[PDB]
């Protein structure tokens, strides 16, 4: 069904975005070692 697949597509979207936040977190965590 189109409804299910679109719902699945939107869940893919949300997972990607959460992954982004994850990497932004890792990026800022690394900058905590930038102390010069």
């Amino acid at each position: 069904r189109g409804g299910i697949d679109i719902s699945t597509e939107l869940s893919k979207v949300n997972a990607s975005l959460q992954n982004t936040v994850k990497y932004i977190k890792e990026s800022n965590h690394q900058l905590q070692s930038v102390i010069v």
Binding site: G2, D5, I6, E9, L10, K12, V13, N14, S16, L17, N19, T20, V21, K22, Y23, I24, E26, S27, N28, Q30, L31, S33, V34, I35, V36
Partner: protein, 62 residues
Amino acid sequence: GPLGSAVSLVQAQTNARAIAAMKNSIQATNRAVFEVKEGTQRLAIAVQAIQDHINTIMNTQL
């Protein structure tokens, strides 16, 4: 006085460490950017499917 040399040598060692970390930071940031791209791409694909539906099952249906 020979201390200034010691001071720059240490700052130099600090900067080198700072740099390596920054590299990891940028790489993690690029990954986040890639993730947002994939997410928008997925959304675009979803939007394209909603478009097809509107001009098909909602077009001929009228």
